[PDB]
């Protein structure tokens, strides 16, 4: 049916701006777990294009799931 969406806060909740120096900053952690979480944080390789926005991340995840379900019954 005709679902009513309230537009209050769509832009604030699509913004996934995490950039280079945050992954570098947590890559330089003495905690080896957080450094193990962020392999993109090395400055010895360039940080490429950022996966923003979060809606494109969720579209990418649903697209991954649909590449999963298509080869199955």
């Amino acid at each position: 049916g005709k679902v009513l969406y309230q537009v209050e806060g769509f832009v604030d909740k699509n913004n996934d701006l995490l950039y280079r120096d945050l992954s570098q900053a947590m890559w330089k952690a003495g905690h080896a777990l957080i450094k193990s979480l962020f392999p993109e944080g090395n400055p010895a390789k360039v940080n490429l294009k950022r996966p923003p926005t979060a809606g494109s991340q969720f579209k990418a995840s649903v697209a991954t799931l649909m590449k999963n379900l298509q080869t199955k019954n």
Partner: protein, 146 residues
């Protein structure tokens, strides 16, 4: 960590209690559940340091400044929370403190630190929290699947 649920930005007093469910028994249910599926004993505490960090990031807030003229700088109002997270996560405080308000544009060989405003400081903080918790969650799934 403090213990009152009004003391955190990501929580409130109005959500502290499901009427029939207590959190401590489910917490011990989880820490009993992690022993079967291969999570070691310092490992779970190392994950709870990360969940502690994701809880503690939200108490950081930002204010603008007058120099420079454009683009306008944001700064941390008080760095008690920054000191507790930077001691907690074992990070030098100048690294993360510079990492809230600036970002390095790095060209072919040249890099520079530029200002973020107040709102984009809140977006970098929010994105740091939920990206940290998200990649923690995916790492837990990989660790189970190992």
């Amino acid at each position: 960590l403090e213990r009152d649920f009004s003391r955190y930005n990501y929580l409130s007093l109005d959500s502290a209690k499901v009427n029939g469910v207590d959190d401590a028994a489910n917490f011990r249910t989880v820490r009993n559940a992690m022993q079967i599926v291969g999570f070691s004993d310092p490992e779970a505490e190392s994950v709870l340091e990360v969940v502690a960090a994701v809880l503690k990031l939200g108490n950081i807030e930002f204010k603008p400044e007058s120099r420079m003229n454009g683009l306008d700088e944001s700064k941390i109002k008080d760095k008690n929370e920054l000191k507790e997270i930077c001691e907690l996560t074992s990070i030098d405080q100048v690294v993360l403190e510079r990492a809230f308000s600036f970002r390095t544009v790095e060209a072919k060989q040249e890099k520079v630190s530029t200002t973020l405003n107040v709102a984009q400081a809140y977006y970098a903080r929010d994105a740091l929290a939920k990206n940290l918790y998200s990649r923690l969650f995916s790492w837990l799934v990989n660790r189970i699947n190992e």
